[PDB]
Amino acid sequence: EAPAAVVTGAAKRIGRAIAVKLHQTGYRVVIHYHNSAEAAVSLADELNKERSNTAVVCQADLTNSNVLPASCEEIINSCFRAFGRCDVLVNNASAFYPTPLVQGKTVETQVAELIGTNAIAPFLLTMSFAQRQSNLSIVNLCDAMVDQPCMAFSLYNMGKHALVGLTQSAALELAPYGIRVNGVAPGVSLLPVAMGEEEKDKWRRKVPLGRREASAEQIADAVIFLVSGSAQYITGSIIKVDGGLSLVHA
Amino acid sequence: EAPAAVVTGAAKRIGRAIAVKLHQTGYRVVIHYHNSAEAAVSLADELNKERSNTAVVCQADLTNSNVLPASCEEIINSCFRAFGRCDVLVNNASAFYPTPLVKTVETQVAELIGTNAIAPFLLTMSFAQRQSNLSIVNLCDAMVDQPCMAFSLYNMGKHALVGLTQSAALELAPYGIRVNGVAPGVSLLPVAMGEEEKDKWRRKVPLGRREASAEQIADAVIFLVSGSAQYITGSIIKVDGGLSLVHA
Amino acid sequence: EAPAAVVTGAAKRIGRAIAVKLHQTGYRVVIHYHNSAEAAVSLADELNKERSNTAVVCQADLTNSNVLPASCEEIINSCFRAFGRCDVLVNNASAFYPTPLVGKTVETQVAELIGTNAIAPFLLTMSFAQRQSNLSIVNLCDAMVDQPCMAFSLYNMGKHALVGLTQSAALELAPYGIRVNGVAPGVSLLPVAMGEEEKDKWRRKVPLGRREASAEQIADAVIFLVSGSAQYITGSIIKVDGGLSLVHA
Amino acid sequence: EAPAAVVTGAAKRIGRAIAVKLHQTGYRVVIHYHNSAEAAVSLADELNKERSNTAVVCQADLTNSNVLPASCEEIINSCFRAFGRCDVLVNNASAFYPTPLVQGKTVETQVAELIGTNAIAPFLLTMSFAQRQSNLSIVNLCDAMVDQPCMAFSLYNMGKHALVGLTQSAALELAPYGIRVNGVAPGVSLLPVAMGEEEKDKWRRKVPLGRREASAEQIADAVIFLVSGSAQYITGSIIKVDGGLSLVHA
Ligand SMILES: NC(=O)C1=CN([C@@H]2O[C@H](COP(=O)(O)OP(=O)(O)OC[C@H]3O[C@@H](n4cnc5c(N)ncnc54)[C@H](OP(=O)(O)O)[C@@H]3O)[C@@H](O)[C@H]2O)C=CC1
Ligand SMILES: NC(=O)C1=CN([C@@H]2O[C@H](COP(=O)(O)OP(=O)(O)OC[C@H]3O[C@@H](n4cnc5c(N)ncnc54)[C@H](OP(=O)(O)O)[C@@H]3O)[C@@H](O)[C@H]2O)C=CC1
Ligand SMILES: NC(=O)C1=CN([C@@H]2O[C@H](COP(=O)(O)OP(=O)(O)OC[C@H]3O[C@@H](n4cnc5c(N)ncnc54)[C@H](OP(=O)(O)O)[C@@H]3O)[C@@H](O)[C@H]2O)C=CC1
Ligand SMILES: NC(=O)C1=CN([C@@H]2O[C@H](COP(=O)(O)OP(=O)(O)OC[C@H]3O[C@@H](n4cnc5c(N)ncnc54)[C@H](OP(=O)(O)O)[C@@H]3O)[C@@H](O)[C@H]2O)C=CC1
Ligand SMILES: COc1ccc2[nH]c(NC(=N)N)nc2c1
Ligand SMILES: COc1ccc2[nH]c(NC(=N)N)nc2c1
Ligand SMILES: COc1ccc2[nH]c(NC(=N)N)nc2c1
Ligand SMILES: COc1ccc2[nH]c(NC(=N)N)nc2c1
């Protein structure tokens, strides 16, 4: 049988590109989404038209709360219910917005969303994936610029740094079970939908390799490498895919 | 007149050593405590005997919750109330225990991520908002990249605190607030740990085959708050006797 | 037309596996070697049997000296003379032995350990870029550089320098479309003459499978980095270490 | 007796400030210099006027060559000759200039000067210091920007990375002899004499903490800390003194 992967926040953008590339490589995919129901079903429809019964959707809020563990448990369970196995987990879903230190969500909600989606949910999903258990691995979407952060993004930066810690800790602890745990760290890839072209070009111009953002496919390419048999001895590694951005001084 | 400092978890061990050394350097101090009221008070008593009305205590739980923001505001306020100013914040309080991948999990999150990361962030917010040699010092961990087996939440918390150190250094630099870290390796070992396990750790340390005293940790804190560190921000000083250099 | 690659120290072990895998991927290869002439030629003959006129050998000492720059220029030149192009440079050759702080002279130890691990890569990179679809350099780094073996300071210095080169060259060559990356093994092929009981001490420390990487596993990461799947990746170093570097003392 | 320190490249700028501050703390000082004979002798005069017989000069080229080991041995020997002990070594001397990868000194000379001064001479001095052996320690002047380097400075950057490696390897190997080895990593401090004012101001404006370069004295302060009794458990550590510069993205 074909292996199966869960990709979180897979309805659009980088998460879709990953689910699509995994699907093209022969994986069955759970397309997790939160709010983007139309886009999720649309993608699953496309993949199922390509090979029937190879894609399902799974809705869940990944904000931290007392029920986040159950929701993460259910995402993994969805993969086993659909396909009878779960070989790969990609932790892609992420909230991203400013939380200035010197200052209409409460700070408690910001913490829940930015730390929950970027770090706590990846942890609980990792726990569930491991407990529910060939080439098993987890790939965490990290951030190449965590050490040179955008001004006023403390909470998002904290969550991405915690995700590096999870990557290392989980690679260590799960290696005995043959589960590898690695990261992919974009620099600038698909810019935010809300960002104007002028601001987008300011970022593009900073990138040494080509003065352009990574395509979603270029990010997926690295994920596909880490899940592949060509990475069978790689665990605890985070591959930057940033066209040299993180090497550029102020 | 004299500058004032808040030290979280200051009743015992490393945070006590930090409080005492700050006091000895001429700071007035807020000794924050959670469960260790008796100890916090005994320390305040010792400090006030040295110099009258230069040490107060402040109780707060730093577990993440709907009230954590209010608690953190209160800790900072208690500094301004007692002393009229708040020059230094030392984020020392910390929970530490295993959370195997294979207390409810969400309590473990609230404690491990709340004490180690979220409370530092909220205290930092309150400290900056209420604003000279202003600085914040976060107690990190030199072994974050070579973590203890089954300690993922703790490690996540400590990595998040590195993130906070950097992001806050960047954002607060315009206000003249410096933000730095001190990363112990093995210092005062956990009360719970057996004596044989303790010696196993001591033996691994290149520099002298022993743990750091609490005062050795406090020494690095004192440097970072001093006028000798006025251009230093976003730096984390390991104080680990070379432990993190030692391969498997 | 087929692309071409130079692999330094390609006669044996990891560099051999890299040359083979590049050849399998459709590259013509320059097999650089220092002392291992018989192994290099054997490899070239094997490759040429697979596909005629796709492999040459090139002898050179990579120890630091006033002739090192000329040597390095000649290695790159040999690829252009054999194949008309040079698409990929793999800085694999490396000396590795203890240099305690407290029977070669120290200046020899410096020339060999810094020359092979750092200076020769720099000179090869300069010659590669000066001579210029999908150009890239891959440097063989070391996952354990921040947790070094006792009494290996010169080796460790050389490998950290190579990190610096990887970063500095990625930045500087990115406008020419040349990517520069690294692959950092932890423990891979150990000396054949090292006792199994000592090899097992290292094997036991690796989380992922309690074994060293094969040379082929290291080569797989090189192949990824030179591939079209890594078109946006520059300045990156991929650890291929089975989680060894994550293990505390 | 008073402890003694060697400071390489101590005639001017940051090395001079370290020598002065060590002297102020109680140390006897060897002022190593290469070309700056007048400024070296002038500094030694000033310190000796303050406390007689507490400063000597020592001339040496730190370019790599087959005789660099003997010159390094000579620098340490000169400390023992003057003061009968050598407690502290400060590796401060450094060449710094561009070495572009793509097109009056030969490349052989560039390597010898940039790798010799920044790395090989530190190693040889460390070896001589250790071989001749209270509170013993070495401090290497590193560079906070080594992961976000200046364009076309590959050989310099390679040398400074090697110096980080040396700091770690020697901290490990010398810990059993009670010798601690640490680094101080400036961002922008005293800017190059040859740099125009507009370019100096460009650099200043990048620094978050104050929009200005470090004083030599601020760099020296961290050196003083690391050699002091307040750093007795610190080895293998590199303290950035960069005003946040390395945190700033492109
Ligand atoms: N884009 C870039 O330039 C960079 C990206 N990255 C990382 O790469 C990954 C992909 O980036 P990108 O595609 O731009 O990500 P997006 O900003 O597009 O977010 C991906 C998905 O995350 C989901 N998500 C957000 N909040 C929640 C929540 N509370 N619960 C559940 N799901 C949620 C959303 O699903 P839905 O729409 O269904 O609600 C969204 O579609 C992320 O981890 C990101 O941090 C890192 C650096 C740069
Ligand atoms: N000891 C070591 O070897 C090492 C220490 N460190 C770091 O150094 C710092 C000091 O370490 P150490 O002195 O051993 O720490 P402790 O484990 O002794 O914790 C310090 C204090 O934190 C307070 N604390 C714990 N949980 C909470 C909570 N939920 N709310 C409020 N306060 C709480 C407690 O105060 P109370 O007693 O009042 O309840 C406790 O006394 C920590 O940040 C630690 O992670 C890092 C690496 C090694
Ligand atoms: N093996 C491992 O576990 C690890 C390897 N690495 C790195 O991976 C790479 C490959 O490793 P491995 O296969 O073990 O390497 P080897 O020890 O087999 O070295 C590769 C080749 O380097 C060449 N070389 C040595 N000295 C010189 C010199 N002075 N001039 C020219 N060439 C010279 C030799 O060529 P010849 O035989 O022709 O004389 C040798 O065959 C190296 O860069 C190494 O540091 C990193 C970490 C661990
Ligand atoms: N200034 C800054 O902004 C920064 C400095 N640093 C580091 O801090 C340290 C001090 O910086 P700075 O004061 O600017 O250094 P300088 O550029 O002023 O160099 C210090 C001294 O090094 C000596 N030196 C140079 N070449 C040789 C050689 N071949 N042999 C022997 N000595 C030599 C010179 O001695 P003489 O005059 O006697 O010939 C020179 O005065 C250096 O390691 C530097 O890389 C790091 C980052 C930023
Ligand atoms: C400004 O370009 C960026 C840099 C980092 C980012 N991280 C994310 N994460 C996300 N969840 N969208 N988007 C980014 C966009
Ligand atoms: C095993 O020695 C350690 C290693 C890391 C630690 N972190 C903490 N933190 C704490 N809050 N006690 N204690 C430690 C004790
Ligand atoms: C522990 O075994 C090792 C670790 C690192 C190494 N680096 C190298 N380099 C080399 N040129 N062989 N060999 C090694 C062997
Ligand atoms: C451009 O400002 C800098 C940044 C790094 C430097 N390193 C040095 N080193 C030196 N030997 N002068 N000078 C520098 C000047």
User: Is residue B133 marked as binding?
Assistant: no
User: Is residue B34 marked as binding?
Assistant: yes
Sign of CA dihedral D220, D226, D231, D232: negative
Q: Whose CA is nearest to atom 2 of ligand 8?
A: D188
**Cα atoms found within 13 Å of the Cα of residue C108, Cβ hemisphere only:** 5
Determination technique for this PDB entry? Answer: X-ray
* Alpha-carbon distances, residue D242 vs A106, A215, D224, D238 (angstroms): 35, 34, 17, 12
* DSSP annotation string for B140-200: --TTTTSPPTT-HHHHHHHHHHHHHHHHHHHHHGGGTEEEEEEEESS-SPPTTS-HHHHHH
Distance separating alpha carbons of residues C51 and D86, to the nearest angstrom: 64
Give the contacts of D223 (CB within 8 A, at least 6 positions apart): D18, D21, D22, D90, D139, D184
Please state the φ and ψ torsions of residue C38, each to the nearest 5 degrees: -65, -40
Strand, helix or coil at A31?
Answer: strand
Distance separating alpha carbons of residues B120 and B135, to the nearest angstrom: 13
Q: Which residue of B has its CA nearest to A175?
A: B149
Q: Give the number of other Cβ atoms within 10 Å of residue C194's Cβ.
A: 11
Atom of ligand 5 nearest to the CA of A195: 1
Which pair of structure tokens corresponds to residue D167?
């700091």
Give the contacts of D42 (CB within 8 A, at least 6 positions apart): none
Which pair of structure tokens corresponds to residue D205?
């404006």
Is C33 a residue of the active site? no
Angle, helices B152-172 vs A154-174, to 10°: value is: 150
D contacts of A249 (beta carbons < 8 Å) = 145, 148-150, 206, 248, 250
Q: In what order do the strands lie in the sheet with C28-33?
A: C55-59, C28-33, C4-7, C88-91, C135-140, C178-185, C237-240
Q: Which residue among A14, A33, A223 has the greatest number of ligand 1 atoms within 8 angstroms of its CB, and so is best to mutate?
A: A14
Mutate to test the interface with B, among A146, A155, A158, A246 (most CBs of B within 10 A): A158
Q: Whose CA is nearest to atom 10 of ligand 5?
A: A96
Distance separating alpha carbons of residues D139 and D136, to the nearest angstrom: 10
Per DSSP, which regions of D65-178 are E strands? 88-91, 136-141
Q: Give the number of other Cβ atoms within 10 Å of residue D141's Cβ.
A: 26
Strand, helix or coil at A91?
Answer: strand
Q: In what order do the strands lie in the sheet with D55-59?
A: D55-59, D28-33, D4-7, D88-91, D136-141, D179-186, D238-241
Distance (Å) from the alpha carbon of C247 to chain B's nearest alpha carbon: 5
Active-site entry in D33, D87, D156, D242: D156
Which pair of structure tokens corresponds to residue C246?
């994550």
Taking alpha carbons only, the member of D18, D54, D2 closest to residue D139 is D18
Which residue has 């017989």 as its token pair?
A: D53
* Inter-residue contact D239 to B232 (CB < 8 Å): yes
Active-site entry in D27, D143, D147, D177: D143
- Spell out the domains of chain D, with CATH numbers in brackets: 4-242 (3.40.50.720)
Distance separating alpha carbons of residues C203 and C209, to the nearest angstrom: 9
User: How many residues in total does chain B contain?
Assistant: 248
Sign of CA dihedral D43, D44, D50, D55: positive
Which pair of structure tokens corresponds to residue C133?
């679809």
Q: Is C243 left (phi over 0), alpha (psi -120 to 50) or beta?
A: left
Distance A239 CA to ligand 2 centre (A): 34
* Inter-residue contact A57 to A31 (CB < 8 Å): yes
Which alpha helices (DSSP H) does chain B contain, by range?
Answer: 13-25, 37-50, 68-83, 105-113, 119-129, 152-172, 195-204, 214-225
Per DSSP, which regions of chain C are E strands? 4-7, 28-33, 55-59, 88-91, 135-140, 178-185, 237-240
Taking alpha carbons only, the member of B150, B161, B145, B74 closest to residue B113 is B161
- Cα torsion B39, B213, B32, B70 to 10°: value is -140
* Alpha-carbon distances, residue B231 vs B89, B135, B168, D193 (angstroms): 18, 11, 15, 22
Give the contacts of C154 (CB within 8 A, at least 6 positions apart): C99, C109, C110, C113, C114, D123
Distance separating alpha carbons of residues A183 and A227, to the nearest angstrom: 11
Give the single-character DSSP code of D91: E
Angle, helices D13-25 vs D216-227, to 10°: value is: 50
Q: Resolution in angstroms, to 1 decimal, for this deposition? A: 1.7
Atom of ligand 6 nearest to the CA of B13: 12
Atom of ligand 4 nearest to the CA of D33: 38
- Count of pairs with CB atoms under 8 A, one residue in B, one in D: 104
Q: Which chains does chain B touch, 3 or more C-beta pairs < 8 A?
A: A, C, D
Give the contacts of D106 (CB within 8 A, at least 6 positions apart): none
Q: Which ligand is nearest to the CA of A116?
A: 1
* Inter-residue contact C217 to C184 (CB < 8 Å): no
Give the single-character DSSP code of A245: G
Q: Give the number of other Cβ atoms within 10 Å of residue B3's Cβ.
A: 18
Strand, helix or coil at A88?
Answer: strand
**Which amino acid type is present at position A164?**
V
Which residue has 């810690």 as its token pair?
A: A165
Give the contacts of A126 (CB within 8 A, at least 6 positions apart): A89, A91, A138, A166, A170, A174, A181, B101
User: Is residue B13 marked as binding?
Assistant: yes
* Inter-residue contact C137 to C169 (CB < 8 Å): yes
Distance separating alpha carbons of residues D176 and D181, to the nearest angstrom: 12
